[PDB]
Design a protein around this ligand. Structure first.
Ligand code: CAP
Ligand code: CAP
Ligand code: MG
Ligand code: MG
Ligand code: MG
Ligand code: MG
Lengths: 118, 464, 464, 227, 119
């Protein structure tokens, strides 16, 4: 038998139970997004912690992050999206970075995963 | 004038040249007449005892207009492969129903016509609700998008589990198995249908112990967790006392059974969850007594179009591959009436009419019952990205415990959502995606051996 | 040890030499196994999947005593005339049920076992309730003895009528037709099942006119009269608002439906009626969807016992010579379970177990469904002196009006009651008693001619 | 792209080939354009500033579909006998309104478009309420038939009167003049618009004095009376 | 003052211009709840006029996107942020969750610049 380690083992949601992500695996998750006509975006924030309230159901803190420049309306190649992750990690090298994707017909998000850790 | 006597039904209730309006309700029956009765006398009798009329003539009918309050039959077609079965169509006006009540609609359609002495069988198949009638209801409290926004979860189907054995555990030991399962990587966990309040465990001693474990398990991984709390009772006062304690503790979701509690207590709870900001999970019990047989009862696609108008966020739907009966082409057909916004007629999937919901929120289907890891790349391909998957016996039966058993159901799931967005087929190659992932995770190879040839295959009863 | 794996059910859930206790609940099933399954493995799964058990083994079962909380099958016998049908018996402990709730029992017994892939049919027949469990319920509000004392009526059965057409009348015409019927000699008057509130007539307007019409006819003949008011709504706070007004106007009786409104909403109404001194009348709707077929569903004698514990005063039992199905030996069998206090086993009438009610009041059966004057000397011999007789279409169809139509019905009953306690036979004779009373009453000879050869004779489906 | 700037209204809000649905609300306006403005520009500007619109372009419009939330002008015709007056038609989608509220409906149509600098006049004429929207309201309490049935009066119109010293009467004198009018043969009697509560006559005793006379005037002729 | 006189058959126009309220009649009313000085004392703002903004497009946004655009505007230097005249409750967005999403953003935007903000 074996024991799961309960000390200092945080997780970060989707695709966080697999071996660490490498290049040519990030570029293939953006091609699948563009051929379904969705809009990419970027975000960053120093600390990923959450809080609560005494007696209010459905309320939590720490769900909003900062937007890099603006959503990219009209992107058609996976080069301009892979060249904007380097400018962000050279100006704020001590923060997290996460990638999104929007849909306007149903007004919901479709993807989210981390690409950098401090 | 007024003449006392007995006449036929066909002279008044059979008009096969009638054009339907846009504010009418339509229904379809599949009947079997009794020897010695014409097929056109049974269809008229079915429609002439659900709206107005009786077995003899009365004198009080001259004070009103009866050409704007009757039900009519306007089509008959025989079935293929039999000799004593037909299909009939009926139309009802709009001024016959009460706004905002579902228990009234059923009472006026399936009230008494099911026990006549001139028939041997009857079954209801479909219905058509006009848009002028759906606007008087409230609908689901939150819907689909508002539920995903609150929990901050996108990309993959959710996961859950239920606690076994069904009955016999204490109150402190019951809150200890929840923490182990929740710290492993699961999103939800669930009580059971028949656990309300019993001498071995009371209802106020379980809430506290569950709440204590949820907070402890939430601050260790850094994700939002939840738990369904059962709220069924035997009185409408005891039911509203158990839903006010969860609001005080700050819990996000509750549970109810809508077929044994009734169609009246469900609307009251749905009207309160909306005003206090909670989520509702619906369990379908005692549903096989009306369904299953193909020559008597009511289809499930009709029982599912009333829950949307009544109120609810989750609904059970069953699994095609499991220990309970189900069929693929019918499930794929009646799963589209729960999520979409405009469906079209299709007789290859059971749909008879055309339905639109004029911007009403949808519901999330749920699949559960007798499944394990080897069934994973067959459930992602059918349902899609909006479902809930529940493993009850596949988690607590792991040879190593509870926490190691939950790390095996998440790796086996995140490896299928990654091989799909690369251009690989999930049907032909399904035993090769859960054979390469079991080479870097020691907790999945230890589980791919206990259950390896356990399959359920049997004959089907309800053949389309 | 633990030894995770999959085993059979018969190894733990088949005890063919067990002695029942005095605090147990027993049930009888009738099943049709799927080809390729031993009979003993079929009856051992129903018990397992109803109290405790799943498809695999779990490690949490070692913390409790399992053979104190499990159900078991202790007898299997084959049916005569078939080759794939048997009867099974199951026993349940007492600590598995919540006190005072009927929903829990139905959720625990008929929850999920009805849709297994290894079976093709199933039907429940009977139950036995120990006296230690029925003492936690309240029971009927008033009963039989108190109602007769309050209404001051002894000697003969009661009478009633219902208004037709079902839908279409206004608020004032509906009220003016009650007075004519009441002044003729009847006792009660009934609304209709599908009449709650509609654009052509609202409830508060109809209540006032009915109340005004009741008073006028009471002071002219000098007898107590009443009328049933429907109190079915679509939400709970609307149902409890229509009873307070009826109490305020001083009306003595109300009405409800207990199969479409649900079990939870019925107990609250029963409690309110007990605490405010009203009377309750129960209408059975949507009951042929579960009954009728003899190889799937639930019998009515089981559905009748739950109503007694839940609460009520009147209940519909159906007729034998009407337009709806029914049999004599079964009706006579299950009337006793409603009226009596100690019933013994009898397989010629459908009873399997012995039942005693330890001094709980009974209920009054009701007969209806398409009878006329010629059927009177055959209905007084079956039921007896404790019943209610209703004529819906046989009163408003008389060739002379409403008031003359009630005298004909009233005279035909007091002539049969008088001829019984003199030594005459009501079965061989009965076409001669009426022809002699129709010689001094001109309002009965006019009715003995319109309906003279009207009968309903067909085959039977549920042959015992 | 985004391309921040200022553009016209006609390029987006003038579609004169549109087929109306059966769940839409329609309206008719009459307008007098300001010298130097084409009629179509004003017709399009009226619709834009009512549902979704402003004087410039914003970047938050790419996150939603704007072809299911806009109002359209689909017809313009000129009046006869003038030279600077026209009639316009507008259509609105169903899901822009709140069920069961009248205050919300008036706020979205006559809210702000009545004070533009490019117009000199405007008047609303008619509306078309679909049957799918009027079913969410309650309507009149009783109606007509339920009102005639309660009072037991058939055949002829009704009658009434109002006491007409508008202000200045006491309470007892006010109650006295009702009896002499009800005993004459009338059916109803009315207060006045500007009479609620004033230092010469409060309400709680006027009610009592009227109620006392109503009962007396009823038992002498044998008919139902009211006030 | 104006109930019926505006529709007489002997006139073709009418307009009201001004009124005079005696001091003996205005003392029976309550008046504004707070006023000017009390409002300024609570927010701790002196010297300059105030600033604000409103969200566009008027109708069509969801509940989370509505709350996202408020934080960005508030963290820039503004003081207030307004809803809209015809936004009460509609199928695309209800009120009980819009309130929560706005409240979550206000607290986050307030603790980063150290100034009082409202909406
Ligand atoms: O009670 C049970 O058996 C379950 O908790 C499954 O447990 P296991 O997974 O451990 O077997 C579910 O209620 C059934 O799936 C009911 O079926 P459904 O609601 O789909 O009809
Ligand atoms: O039409 C009806 O529905 C009745 O009013 C009978 O009216 P008529 O006597 O005028 O035919 C009763 O409800 C039926 O007897 C119900 O059957 P049951 O209670 O036996 O299930
Ligand atoms: Mg279960
Ligand atoms: Mg009836
Ligand atoms: Mg006036
Ligand atoms: Mg504005």
């Amino acid at each position: 038998m074996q024991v799961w380690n309960p000390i200092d083992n945080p997780k970060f949601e989707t695709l966080s139970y697999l071996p660490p992500l490498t290049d040519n695996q990030i570029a293939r998750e953006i091609d699948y997004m563009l051929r379904n006509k969705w809009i990419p975006c970027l975000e960053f924030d120093p600390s990923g912690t959450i809080t609560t309230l005494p007696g209010q159901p459905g309320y939590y803190g720490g769900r909003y992050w900062t937007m890099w420049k603006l959503p990219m309306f009209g992107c058609n190649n996976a080069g301009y999206v892979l060249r904007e992750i380097e400018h962000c990690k050279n100006a704020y090298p001590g923060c997290f970075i996460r990638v999104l994707g929007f849909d306007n017909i149903r007004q919901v998000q479709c993807c989210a995963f981390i690409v950098h850790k401090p | 004038g007024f003449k006392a006597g007995v006449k036929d039904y066909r002279l008044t209730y059979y008009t096969p040249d009638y054009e339907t309006k846009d504010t009418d309700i339509l229904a379809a029956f599949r009947m079997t007449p009794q020897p010695g009765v014409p097929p056109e006398e049974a269809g008229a009798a079915v429609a002439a005892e659900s709206s107005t009329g009786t077995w003899t003539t009365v004198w009080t009918d001259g004070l009103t207009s009866l050409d704007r309050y009757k039900g009519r039959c306007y089509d008959i077609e025989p079935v293929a492969g039999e000799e004593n079965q037909y299909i009939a169509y009926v139309a009802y006006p709009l001024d016959l129903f009460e706004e905002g009540s579902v228990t009234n609609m059923f009472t006026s359609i399936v009230g008494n016509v099911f026990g006549f002495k001139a028939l041997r069988a009857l079954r209801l198949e479909d219905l058509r609700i006009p848009p002028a009638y759906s606007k008087t209801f409230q609908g689901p409290p939150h819907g689909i998008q508002v539920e995903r926004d609150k929990l901050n979860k996108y990309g993959r189907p959710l996961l859950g589990c239920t606690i076994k054995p069904k009955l016999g555990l204490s109150a402190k030991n019951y809150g200890r198995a929840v923490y182990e399962c929740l710290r492993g990587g699961l999103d939800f966990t669930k009580d059971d249908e028949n656990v309300n309040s019993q001498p071995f465990m009371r209802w106020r001693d379980r809430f506290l112990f569950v709440a204590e474990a949820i907070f402890k398990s939430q601050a260790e991984t850094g994700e939002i967790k939840g738990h369904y709390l059962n709220a069924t009772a035997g009185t409408c006062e005891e039911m509203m006392k158990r839903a006010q304690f969860a609001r005080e503790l700050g819990m996000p979701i509750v549970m109810h059974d809508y077929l044994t509690g009734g169609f009246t207590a469900n609307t009251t709870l749905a009207h309160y969850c909306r005003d206090n900001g909670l989520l509702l999970h619906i369990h379908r019990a005692m549903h096989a007594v009306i369904d299953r047989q193909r020559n008597h009862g009511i289809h499930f696609r009709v029982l599912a179009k009333a829950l949307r108008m009544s109120g609810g966020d989750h609904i059970h739907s069953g699994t095609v591959v499991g220990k309970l009966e189900g069929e693929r082409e019918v499930t794929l057909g009646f799963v589209d009436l729960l999520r979409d916004d405009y469906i079209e007629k299709d007789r290859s999937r059971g749909i008879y009419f055309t339905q639109d919901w004029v911007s009403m929120p949808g519901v999330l289907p749920v699949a559960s019952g007798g499944i394990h890891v080897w069934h994973m790349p067959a459930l992602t391909e059918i349902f899609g990205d909006d479902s809930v998957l529940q493993f009850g016996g596949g988690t607590l039966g792991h040879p190593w415990g509870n926490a190691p058993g939950a790390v095996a159901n998440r790796v086996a799931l995140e490896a299928c959502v990654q091989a799909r967005n690369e251009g690989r087929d999930l049907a032909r190659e399904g035993n090769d995606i859960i054979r390469e992932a079991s080479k870097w995770s020691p907790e999945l190879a230890a589980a791919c051996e206990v259950w390896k040839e356990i399959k359920f295959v049997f004959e089907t009863i309800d053949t389309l």
